Design a protein around this ligand. Structure first.
Ligand SMILES: O=C1C[C@@H](c2ccc(O)cc2)Oc2cc(O)cc(O)c21
Ligand SMILES: O=C1C[C@@H](c2ccc(O)cc2)Oc2cc(O)cc(O)c21
Lengths: 391, 392
């Protein structure tokens, strides 16, 4: 039924997939969240909606966000009233920005990780590009290859319209890319701009208004590879286990539609409830596969900060000491919800703070840890990591 | 820069090559004869007065190598939406309404056929890869297919949106690493394309857009890919041995596609069949050196994405292939048109059945090795070196 077998024609690697470098970047315009409602209702000329604006200040005050970064600014928004309206034909100007600027922002981040990695660009064999902001053909992955000058033969994978969970998904993809091909070095970039989703306020769509309070811009990048060249490359985290789950009872919890008015956002279920109701069995299964088992308080946490209530209730139902979501709360506070890019921001922050504080490992002195993606589906991606030992 | 002491791989990997274990296809119900499509198209777009354009379109249609296409769009549907029959009126929203529903739906038909031939319970599918360039949504068509098929909540999904005609080669490259790096992985790969996003009226000043209206058709195909097959339970059809991607030289801008409020727009800004056929020699000889260190182009089997007849004709020409090499690729073009990422999988199915039916020695026309090729928008060339299985 088969021809005589032959040796693996493309040699695989032997160790686990490993993060060799992380780099991040953000657009230049900073918005303090405490005065965001004044700004938002000005630039959308909706100051007549007094009660709604009061509702919005509530949402921002409780978002857990201190500031956000945006490609958009007051100059750009006044030039584009159709994006300042709530529901106006827009999609073309929105595309015209993001198809250019998300690979640009991904380039900044990619270049920092490449600098930290320190090997020549030519040793990059795969590119994985992930975004929720706009689509084009050829894709941002191709544009990133052009902007960087990688080999024309890099193997590319373009991930469009993914949602907040794909920070976890890119780990699972790069895991197989790096481990099945010997010598592979995977450049992974998540780049997100809210220009597809900024819109004016509407008194009958408060869920859209939550989005306006939570979403910010940012790009994150990592270099993943197996069998790191000792004394030349530097490991920071190891990918050991990956899993994906559509949580029970979550049909229709979050939807997003790309329409003539841009990307629209729709909440219809208790997202933090469903996540914290089901996270225990998700992580129990994972820990059984991986170990046979350490506590939840004795691993490092990298969790996507969908909103504060997600981290709050996961912290509550799993009885985590408040220090566990710290690195995750810290990123949400400095940047808001950057969709897929958040977890690589948390991962970078976690390792840097581990070094500065001279802890035993790169995961706050713990050996094992979790990366968690949350989004539409409701979809949960689970990534069990190992850190590296540190001085 | 130290490392915790190594431990055995947490997730066991497979050892054999990724193997195709089943193929299924499906098409929408509405059939459009190619010879009289010009009469139909120019009438439904209210342009019978564009009389020189029509005769140019009849020329493209007759010289397209296509005998018929299948489409979700029918007559009735198109009159419901005059903004889609215009060349350039805003209509993305009615397009999205169609394809976010019908893309997963047609993929379900193909996937169910595939699972039936595969023979195993659908509960043993561990991975889903959904490939399309018809519309986007959150959650994606990959989520909807999981729902309509009733697969496990915990399938590892990969959602490929807005890909291009090369991605039928990309899914194979994607599924190769999924299957090989995960012992017992069984990957459902589905490509599903509907022209509802790309259909639009004619324009004298955009004959590239008009080329697409002559070549693009609808369809979906699905495969099951796994490594280390269960002996006597599963049946291997092709093995994936080597994959490669190249952006062809100086091909900057040859094929673009933009999703706008008027839908998906299509542009040819260079000589595409020339660029492919000028460089495919270099692409193929590198792949053959990698896997063989060596069979001749006429002694392998060919699954070539038939973006249009000129491409196949000029690859046939400059590699100097005996004309039965591209036979199977032309057959699918003739019977279906260009179905974007779904074509090479239709060709793979037709190739193996033609081989079984004519009692040849392997699933690949009697050859051990073969090529699957994708072409699209970098200009990107996807290369797959495959092996057949012996039949008797
Ligand atoms: O509507 C959006 C915008 C998107 C987004 C966030 C930040 C960014 O920078 C770019 C896009 O995030 C989302 C995530 C979802 O799960 C569902 C959604 O509808 C959206
Ligand atoms: O314009 C389109 C539409 C798409 C398509 C084909 C058939 C089908 O049924 C659905 C979509 O194929 C493409 C492939 C490309 O490389 C570039 C493009 O611009 C396009």
């Amino acid at each position: 039924a088969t021809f005589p077998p032959c040796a693996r024609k493309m040699e695989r690697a032997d160790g686990p997939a490993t993060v060799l470098a992380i780099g991040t970047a953000n657009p230049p315009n900073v918005f303090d969240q405490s005065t965001y409602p004044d700004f938002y209702f000005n630039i959308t000329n909706s100051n007549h909606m007094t009660d709604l604006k009061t509702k919005f200040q509530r949402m921002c005050d409780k978002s857990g966000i201190t500031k956000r970064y945006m490609y958009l600014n007051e100059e750009i928004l006044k030039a584009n009233p159709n994006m300042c309206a709530y529901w106006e034909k827009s999609l073309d100007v929105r595309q015209d920005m993001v198809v250019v600027e998300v690979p640009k922002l991904g380039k900044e981040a990619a270049t920092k990780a490449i600098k930290e990695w320190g090997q020549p660009k030519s040793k990059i064999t795969h590119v994985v590009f992930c975004t929720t902001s706009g689509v084009d053909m050829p894709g941002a992955d191709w544009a990133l290859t052009k902007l960087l000058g990688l080999r024309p033969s890099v193997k590319r994978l373009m991930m469009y319209q993914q949602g907040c969970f794909a920070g976890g998904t890119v780990m699972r993809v790069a895991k197989d890319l790096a481990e099945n091909n010997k010598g592979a070095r995977v450049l992974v970039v998540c780049s997100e701009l809210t220009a597809v989703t900024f819109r004016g306020p509407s008194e009958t769509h408060l869920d859209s208004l939550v989005g306006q309070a939570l979403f910010g811009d940012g790009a994150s990048a990592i270099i993943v590879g197996a069998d790191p060249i000792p004394e030349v490359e530097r490991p920071w985290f190891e990918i050991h286990y990956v899993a994906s789950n559509i949580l029970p009872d979550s049909d229709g919890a979050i939807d997003g539609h790309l329409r003539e008015v841009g990307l629209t956002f729709h909440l219809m279920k208790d997202v933090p409830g469903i996540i914290s109701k089901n996270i225990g069995t998700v992580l129990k299964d994972a820990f059984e596969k991986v170990f046979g088992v350490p506590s939840y308080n004795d691993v490092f946490w990298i969790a996507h900060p969908g909103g504060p209530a997600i981290l709050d209730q996961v912290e509550q139902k799993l009885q985590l000491k408040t220090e566990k979501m710290a690195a995750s709360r810290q990123v949400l506070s400095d940047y808001g919800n950057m969709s897929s890019a958040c977890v690589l921001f948390i991962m970078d922050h976690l390792r840097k703070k581990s070094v500065e504080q001279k802890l035993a490992t790169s995961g706050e002195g713990y050996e094992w840890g979790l990366l968690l993606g949350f989004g539409p589906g409701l979809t949960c991606e689970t990534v069990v990591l190992r850190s590296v030992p540190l001085a």
